[PDB]
Peptidyl-prolyl cis-trans isomerase A (Homo sapiens), 163 residues
Amino acid sequence: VNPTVFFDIAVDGEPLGRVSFELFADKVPKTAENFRALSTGEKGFGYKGSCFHRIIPGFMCQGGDFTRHNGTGGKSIYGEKFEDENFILKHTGPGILSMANAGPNTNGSQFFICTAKTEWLDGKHVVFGKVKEGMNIVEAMERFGSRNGKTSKKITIADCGQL
């Protein structure tokens, strides 16, 4: 009964594969709903066509800036920002989905998928989902990243929605 959403990933326009996510609406319903709605586009804006602007192998993939495509933008379905809902869930290993932010209570649309255990983020970033299928596609995404985060090819969300 937790929702599952998918991203279809492309590399320089060429399909790579699909990664689906379980969203923990039972624990962080407000945060889960923001990501779900941005994935379906039902409010008139969202993730479809946006890029992953920062990929650091052995750490994480960051995306969700659909307004400036570079980490400075994005917005939530609740307004420009919203609060840290809770910190019940921890960054326990690869596949964790967690909100990017710029201080307390500044969640927007940007998120990251962890590709490592990142315990130092506990209590500072809201964990709200996990990769359910296609972790191999995330691992293939990593290979286009670099130490400073710049990607060698353009990694986009070609399609997305709810399963």
Remarks:
- The chain has one domain: 1-163.
